[PDB]
Design a protein around this ligand. Sequence first.
Ligand SMILES: *[C@@H]1O[C@H](CO)[C@@H](O[C@@H]2O[C@H](CO)[C@@H](O[C@@H]3O[C@H](CO)[C@@H](O)[C@H](O)[C@@H]3O)[C@H](O)[C@H]2NC(C)=O)[C@H](O)[C@H]1NC(C)=O
Ligand SMILES: *[C@@H]1O[C@H](CO)[C@@H](O[C@@H]2O[C@H](CO)[C@@H](O[C@@H]3O[C@H](CO)[C@@H](O)[C@H](O)[C@@H]3O)[C@H](O)[C@H]2NC(C)=O)[C@H](O)[C@H]1NC(C)=O
Ligand SMILES: *[C@@H]1O[C@H](CO)[C@@H](O[C@@H]2O[C@H](CO)[C@@H](O)[C@H](O)[C@H]2NC(C)=O)[C@H](O)[C@H]1NC(C)=O
Ligand code: NAG
Ligand code: NAG
Ligand code: CA
Ligand code: CA
Ligand code: CA
Ligand code: CA
Ligand code: CA
Ligand code: CA
Ligand code: MG
Lengths: 912, 676
Amino acid sequence: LNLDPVQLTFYAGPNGSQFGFSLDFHKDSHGRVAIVVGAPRTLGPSQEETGGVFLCPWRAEGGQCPSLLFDLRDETRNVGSQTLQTFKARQGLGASVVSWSDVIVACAPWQHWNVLEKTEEAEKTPVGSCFLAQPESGRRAEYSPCRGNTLSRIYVENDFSWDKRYCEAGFSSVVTQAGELVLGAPGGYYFLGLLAQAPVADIFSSYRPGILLWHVSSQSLSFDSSNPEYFDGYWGYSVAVGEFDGDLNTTEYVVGAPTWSWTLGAVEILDSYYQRLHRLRGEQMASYFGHSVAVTDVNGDGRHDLLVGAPLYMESRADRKLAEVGRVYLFLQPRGPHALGAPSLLLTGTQLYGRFGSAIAPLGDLDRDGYNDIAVAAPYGGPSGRGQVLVFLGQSEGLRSRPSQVLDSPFPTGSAFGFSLRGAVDIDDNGYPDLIVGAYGANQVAVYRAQPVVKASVQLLVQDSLNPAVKSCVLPQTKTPVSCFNIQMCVGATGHNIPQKLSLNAELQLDRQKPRQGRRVLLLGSQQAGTTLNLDLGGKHSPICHTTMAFLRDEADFRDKLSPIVLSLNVSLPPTEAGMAPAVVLHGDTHVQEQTRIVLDCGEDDVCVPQLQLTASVTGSPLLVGADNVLELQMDAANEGEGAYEAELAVHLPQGAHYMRALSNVEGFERLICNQKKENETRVVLCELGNPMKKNAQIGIAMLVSVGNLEEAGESVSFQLQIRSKNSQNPNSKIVLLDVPVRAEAQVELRGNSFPASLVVAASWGPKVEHTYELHNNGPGTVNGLHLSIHLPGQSQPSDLLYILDIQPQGGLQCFPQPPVNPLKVDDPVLVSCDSAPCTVVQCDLQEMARGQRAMVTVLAFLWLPSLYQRPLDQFVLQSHAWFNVSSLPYAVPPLSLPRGEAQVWTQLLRA
Amino acid sequence: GPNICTTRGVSSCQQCLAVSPMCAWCSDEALPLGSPRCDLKENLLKDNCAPESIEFPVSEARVLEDRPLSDKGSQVTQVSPQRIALRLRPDDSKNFSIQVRQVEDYPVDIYYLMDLSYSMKDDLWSIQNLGTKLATQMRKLTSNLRIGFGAFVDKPVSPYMYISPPEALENPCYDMKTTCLPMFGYKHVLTLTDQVTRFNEEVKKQSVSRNRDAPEGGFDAIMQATVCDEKIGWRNDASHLLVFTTDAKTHIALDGRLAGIVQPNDGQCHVGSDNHYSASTTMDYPSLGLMTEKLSQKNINLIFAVTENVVNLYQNYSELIPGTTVGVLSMDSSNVLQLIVDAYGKIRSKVELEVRDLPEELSLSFNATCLNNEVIPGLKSCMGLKIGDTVSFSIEAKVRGCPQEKEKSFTIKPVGFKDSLIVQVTFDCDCACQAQAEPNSHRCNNGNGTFECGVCRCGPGWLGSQCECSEEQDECSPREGQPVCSQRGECLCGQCVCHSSDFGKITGKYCECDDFSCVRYKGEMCSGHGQCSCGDCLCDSDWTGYYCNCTTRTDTCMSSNGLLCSGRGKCECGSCVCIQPGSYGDTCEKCPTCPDACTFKKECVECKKFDRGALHDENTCNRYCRDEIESVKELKDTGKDAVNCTYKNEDDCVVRFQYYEDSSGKSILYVVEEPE
Ligand SMILES: *[C@@H]1O[C@H](CO)[C@@H](O[C@@H]2O[C@H](CO)[C@@H](O[C@@H]3O[C@H](CO)[C@@H](O)[C@H](O)[C@@H]3O)[C@H](O)[C@H]2NC(C)=O)[C@H](O)[C@H]1NC(C)=O
Ligand SMILES: *[C@@H]1O[C@H](CO)[C@@H](O[C@@H]2O[C@H](CO)[C@@H](O[C@@H]3O[C@H](CO)[C@@H](O)[C@H](O)[C@@H]3O)[C@H](O)[C@H]2NC(C)=O)[C@H](O)[C@H]1NC(C)=O
Ligand SMILES: *[C@@H]1O[C@H](CO)[C@@H](O[C@@H]2O[C@H](CO)[C@@H](O)[C@H](O)[C@H]2NC(C)=O)[C@H](O)[C@H]1NC(C)=O
Ligand SMILES: *[C@@H]1O[C@H](CO)[C@@H](O)[C@H](O)[C@H]1NC(C)=O
Ligand SMILES: *[C@@H]1O[C@H](CO)[C@@H](O)[C@H](O)[C@H]1NC(C)=O
Ligand SMILES: [Ca+2]
Ligand SMILES: [Ca+2]
Ligand SMILES: [Ca+2]
Ligand SMILES: [Ca+2]
Ligand SMILES: [Ca+2]
Ligand SMILES: [Ca+2]
Ligand SMILES: [Mg+2]
């Protein structure tokens, strides 16, 4: 939230270079903290861009950087016939600079090694490297985990596989806190992916300077796979460590795969032995799902929550169908081994081509609020198009979709500002995890310093009502009859590491919503609209409360006595200090509005005790869960006592409820019925009347309840109604509680017909006949143990007019005929019914069926020529009936009816 | 008679002409104080208002150019009217007819891109004769054709190609016995030429290269082919077609990090004097939105031509890039010809209108009316067109306020076509009595006030033509029980002066109607698509429904049969809801219990021939009867590829016909001519 953009110091580094592109907070020779910033294409020994790794210390002046020296001087040997050399030119040392407690592990992902097969060759394939230089000097020892020799054709395998030349080791790495080291290698097994793991304690041991081929016994690489999903997945583009899927000791991997399943992309969670646990699928094609993977606990539950970038994400709008605005997904971790389904929420930038989501850096509790916050950078964002960095703050639900803070690029166009970020470590022991942003186009690195944050809390206290008759004060310097009343203000700001010299300007305004000649209340002394009070909050978190002395003006001064009096409060930091860089950054609530009125319309007894009366009723008691329910709850509010001020009804609605509109004892409306209980506080957002309620006034309100998709409402929902007023004594009427039951009876309709119904004769096997029976619980309520019983005349015998060929039940329904159908493939009307003649009842059972689901069963049969030609002058009518029922509903007592029904199928014959 | 003009606008002539088009203002200063100044024209005439004081402003949709739409594309204008001197007033809308029409004989630009990786060799050996066989066909569809050629492999940089021995830096093709050409990212070959033989000459001399990984660098080649307008040779009055062949995946942006190439593509074109994409090894791959906007601006149409091994990928792409068509390309690549002709037929069939530089305060609701009279509401595009066909539209623009910019403009354009409509928008917000204002009039409190349009502007707390009253008494409310000035003003001398509001101003004769107090749909004032009307949401021009939730979206409502929600179902908010029980599908097209083509679609014999029955007084007689009525007479084809059917009429006569499906659906009838 803080990220001071006025002094973004600059660790300027070699002009060319790309000074930047990677960075990480690393220790010093004796404790302390420094900055390791990668810098490809710098300090060419023989003037070829090798790209040293700088070791910039911390200083506010932003000077140049001392260098961590490597043996950038080639290494070459030969064992018996393999003249192997590790070519050292045109690699980006510093492209990853991940560190450890006393070890810098800076890597050079495009470093080379040429596995010639004596005379034959298998190329200087970038095997990557990781130049594990120890600070405090000591062994500067290097280990490219893919440095296993090969004679080319032997372990091409003739599959082109089982060979791992192009690892590019160092493209991503996170030193596990246990003491291992992972080296995500997007080129493993022909670009399919890799993940080389090795301990860091022993790796230093197993080094022979001058040796080119040597494999540590403790390597463990991901196994090649043949699934055409993975082929050129770039698996291991970015990795992470996190206790995702319950593998504590066999700590999981979060291996990225930004181009998987033909550019859909995925982020997979794997154990130490490369076994998948889940897989998160990309939402949009070519959106680069997984370019930057961040593992952090946004919701503050104790479960790591995955964040995935989609930098090339394109959105559809009314005014723009295709707009590259980037997107950042969030996946909250559910309890247990439960699968990660749909994205919990989607963050979205606004600038075109801003490449939103190109770098996600978990900033930690940036504002120290208990919820982790992340930073999503826009290299090409901002109105000018030079680049932006958008900061999002976590909460219980996840991330708020709007950027709490935005930084514009101070370096010119082309600087690619925001390409790389870091967090989680305070850079200057100021108590806040800073952020260090690279701009590789500008060869500079600008670090943003998080400044101590204060939490704004606004509160304006006023008396409940204004009584003109009570005039115990006087207006100073005059004799105005004043209905004086005291007004108190209270504002506090808490925070951590707040500067010891912090002050605020507490400004209060009287008679806010009213002009100079329409004011009703003023300061007694100065006779002014308001004044500003000074507060000393340096090092003190408890609020300061001050009370002002407010009066009422003369009756003849102004005519309006019925319009309400509205007051507004604002709190803002004192003006910016010299050199900008505000000492703190103010957030939270900033504006609050309160209102009061004069005692009026309480009768003639001066004792204003309202008696609000409310009557309530319930319509549509059987609530179908998630249906097109149209509920118009009608209640009437009457005040049999005296005047009630700002008396409005507050009703608590479930999550799935939505407001469609409504009139009420309106005669003021029909589309507006507001609702209180809105998010935090706001227990008045509803409409007013308290304005005030006239004596014996009777207003009835009608509002529409639309029960939406709420499958987690439970066995029932409760509606609570109570009128809320500004009064102190008897502020509210009697509590009206309406336990509207949700006892769910689902409506299942049984339908059936014959195809074709009629049968004409034209001029050896006859045409087939389809009988269509469809089952669909149009009732949105869930049903369990649904039963279908098929009753047919006869027992499917060949002697019948119709011979059943087969039954083909689709839609996940299983039926059990008795006796079983299709015993043989072959190829005054008498009422023959299931009850009279022997019957073959086919019973179908459904354990669970979802809302709006449908079922389809197809019946196959063929005609009989000898039977058809019999009785040419007789009309045959074929009748078939179906029955179904529901054994029970998954509820304690839904004592209305067990769902059931029947269908009728008619078939007729005609003569031509 | 009180109306909207009376109880709302009692301030100025400007507000009177801003409220409603009917509202009329009288500037006669001798009118008695109390009568409604802004009211019906007949009402003002009845109060003997001065005719010069009567204000009657009317918007108009005035056409400046109405040049006839040409017959042949041999300037040839397809969009009429060419240019509109539109004139709008505050909070008003205006309508006008636009007849887009695809003239036959429109010139065609084709730029044949091509991939050149190692797996492309056979296709190259097949395409060596492409180009004369493309002209041979396109000579039927247009008179002027120009073709171009291209190539691409991938970024010339490790790890994407083979480089050892140091003698394989020039020849990545050494490990295998045959040799093939080096690295290259994109190389323009031929500029669009009339002589079609030049493409054939140029493609022969090309030869295959080799890379390492399966995906290739085509997107760079497409962007460079788009942006170098001068280099390619694009025409301005023609059709631009870009054919993009491949047989594997294609690299996208940020894939180039594996080589250290991190500079994002700027969108310019860097094809130097050697026709080689110079920044190939220093510039990243191209995104998908840059791709789309560059194809749009240059009026470029893209035709993908993947191999089945990947269609499902590319068609999963040509759907996030409008104006694009995917196809199946055989491995030998002998079908790109017919694919390109089918793609040309397809691109011209669809006719969609796009609006550019449309100001935020303006909204356009279309209302197609394609071939026949389908005044299809909520539609801005038509299909099934034929070359030479004409379509019409009903486009209406609504302005939100009186914007500061007096002259603003926007364009309405057919997809990938030169000619388009230029809209001159003028906001008329000026009265007549304004010019003759009398500031410092002596009648306005001894000369400290300005008199204009029959009112002296007294100071705060004072009102009237002479500021006669400050404190005091009349009736300031419509009803006795109603509050004075709606709790929003003061009964100052019989007039309600609305209180000051931080957000804005309170209007109405008694300060009754506000301006910022309407309901929302998703945290947005009238869904962010409506406008505030004294407690009720009113939508903009292209926002339908009471809640202003949803615009003229139809893409998901479009059905392959050729209508919204197939036959059954209303297209509510771009989505189709099934009405017939048992019917399901994308547009409820599948229905097992529904009548077949032989049962329900017999109205061609009933409504088209011997007009009788239902659907006679509605525009649905030929809406469903629009199939090819072939005049066959009982052919000896009583069922070979479909189901033959025969019905009995009222007079016991049989009619035999058969049409179910030939290739994904054919609206061809086989009804007999003479019944028996
Ligand atoms: C182009 O996009 C379409 C749509 O995304 C891809 O096909 C569809 O992909 C979805 C997502 O997996 C499939 O849903 C799945 O259904 C199976 C059961 O059928 C279920 O087990 C999965 O969990 C998931 O729900 C959908 O079936 C699938 N449909 C088709 C037509 O394949 C399509 O594959 C994309 N083209 C390619 C190959 O990139
Ligand atoms: C989109 O276009 C349709 C068609 O213009 C609009 O619906 C139509 O509304 C108009 C009145 O605004 C109707 O006009 C009248 O038609 C009758 C003949 O039916 C004629 O005798 C009258 O003189 C007058 O022209 C028109 O019939 C009606 N058309 C239909 C059925 O769609 C629709 O309002 C437009 N959408 C909007 C609001 O822009
Ligand atoms: C097309 O434009 C005309 C003229 O602007 C509109 O005319 C309206 O007609 C109705 C009905 O008589 C009147 O109540 C309106 O006051 C007229 N408005 C104006 C501005 O003249 C007509 O409604 C428009 N139709 C559409 C759909 O745009
Ligand atoms: C760094 O290189 C750039 C581009 O060639 C040049 O403009 C600049 O002057 C050089 N160094 C500085 C910062 O002077
Ligand atoms: C705070 O904002 C309000 C308007 O929302 C303004 O009236 C006030 O003057 C501002 N701050 C102060 C207390 O000056
Ligand atoms: Ca653990
Ligand atoms: Ca969590
Ligand atoms: Ca936070
Ligand atoms: Ca700090
Ligand atoms: Ca091929
Ligand atoms: Ca390649
Ligand atoms: Mg290839």
